[PDB]
Amino acid sequence: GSLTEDGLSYKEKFVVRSYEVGSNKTATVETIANLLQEVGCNHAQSVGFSATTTTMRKLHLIWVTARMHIEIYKYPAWGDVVEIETWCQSEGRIGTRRDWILKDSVTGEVTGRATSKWVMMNQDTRRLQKVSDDVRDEYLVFCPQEPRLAFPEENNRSLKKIPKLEDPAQYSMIGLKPRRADLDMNQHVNNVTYIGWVLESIPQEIVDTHELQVITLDYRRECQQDDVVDSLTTTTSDSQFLHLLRLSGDGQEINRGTTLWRKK
Amino acid sequence: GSLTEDGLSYKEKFVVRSYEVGSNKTATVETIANLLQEVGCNHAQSVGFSATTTTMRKLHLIWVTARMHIEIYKYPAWGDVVEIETWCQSEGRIGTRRDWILKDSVTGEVTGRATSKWVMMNQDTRRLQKVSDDVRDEYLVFCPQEPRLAFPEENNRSLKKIPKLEDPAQYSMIGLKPRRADLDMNQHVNNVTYIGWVLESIPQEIVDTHELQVITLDYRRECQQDDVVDSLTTTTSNDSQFLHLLRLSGDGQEINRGTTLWRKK
């Protein structure tokens, strides 16, 4: 991959692998989420980051995901080249927003797009902090100053408020534990595993006769390696679902979200 | 990737990704196992397979793994290019053997190597059958006739007999279920998931202070999407050895058995 001419965004092409596809021989939504994560990581590395920043390391501050929104029009087939352009932008003292555009490398058409909201927090105390001026000036030089939104639309499905699933749930997948393959290089369960866990409560029949068009996920709390998760789903309708990840014990909420599916 | 000049092997380079590395910032053994699987799938596609032949699809036959043996000297770091050369060979009427060599793309040194044994089976009845001559002649043209072994050694750890773990196990990981990300394009549990499940019973302290050097895994039965697995381990030893066992949580039906060897960092 590489930064674009202006150095205000990054592009990368990926060839879809055999183990990255589902029953329909097209990349899964977890494969796409992994590639978004990878292109965002490469973009940070290309401009001198290594989480990010030098003064942030001194204060033990990290960037965490608060919301992920992914909309797919066409899933790349096994063997296809998909090009992803990503960029970051400042949302004032609230935090940052990272956007993505997925394209077919042969036709150049947009086959999907994603958006994410990140908040600043203390690695140790887990306390959210409002973005400071000295930290803002460090990354602003790598962001476009004019707004560049993957989801520009007036009142789009990416900024909607997600409600809490009421008990009893219609569908459920209980006793979900992460294995070592679910952890990142810092031994934390990465954001993509939560997506897979959310979709575990979706009934197999829906998966077999529908394609996932949209997924909006809110991150409330991190799941420890020794925590057990319950995935809950309810049809709220194309098919719509309301989701909830919570700890198997106390029932402490770790995630909430919505998915939208279209008939094949 | 591409077939080599003679068309009797296939090569492919891979760049190691951020989500593919562990705490050491080097590729995990499941990432390597995924790349071996990928280069073997690309080799079959490059010579006209999908790795079933015309005679096989007609009789509802499939190739299944009976054993996987992986030996790593150096795990590629995040951002490194690793080159993998793979080839297949005939082991008479028993079945086929697929081999791999992993190299550093910068230095050209061998950083690892793998071997696998495959048996022929009816997809529906799950019954093994010996390779027939009409099926053998279909893939023999894509294999070297002279032996080409990644593990040539006289008394190599790849052909050793694996014993069954005796109860009680020293270590265990109970209640392991595969999720949809664990399934392949045909809704079957990926062979790589069994490797991850085997290593779940290895204690975290061993993982933190050791590097996995060898893993030999025997496949006895496939795990259904709605089956629950128990992973069992016992130390059998400078270097640490383990005996492993995957079995169904209910009846205790054996699905996998194996051994791992670790060395101090």
Ligand SMILES: CN[C@@H]1CCCN(c2ccccc2)C1=O
């Ligand atoms: C996780 N979000 C971070 C926060 C701010 C810095 N940053 C970034 C900006 C431009 C290029 C590379 C990286 C991000 O994406």
Ligand SMILES: CN[C@@H]1CCCN(c2ccccc2)C1=O
């Ligand atoms: C399990 N091994 C399979 C079946 C036998 C033939 N075969 C292959 C040989 C040469 C090129 C491409 C594929 C395989 O990989």
